[PDB]
Amino acid sequence: PMGLLPLKVTHTTLCWGSTKLRTDVRKSMQVKNTADKRLVIRLGIQGPGFQLVGTDSSTITLQAMECRSVVINFCPTVCGAAIGALSFYAPPGAHNSNQPGLEIPLYGYGGS
């Protein structure tokens, strides 16, 4: 009687490579989490142009069991300091939440 079913995520954090000016880079990530309950959460992004663009759907009628796709495209023209980030919101009900509101570190700048 021995066995475990651990679950890991890849969306928790995004990794970017060396980007040069006048160049275009496209990154994509997905998160998976088998849930037994049906909770409705709302996800939003800030910063027009660069961010988790794509088929990002969370606010809709879904739950942890669903799937979240985050695709970001970087294509700066000059060395700048612009970075994005994803924010999470608490559910409507009074679900036991321990200091929610996680933020994913999205580091990405332009070359020189």
TrEMBL record:
Residues 5-111 form the Cep192/Spd-2-like domain. Transmembrane segments: none annotated. This is BcDNA.LD24702. The lineage of its organism: Eukaryota, Metazoa, Ecdysozoa, Arthropoda, Hexapoda.
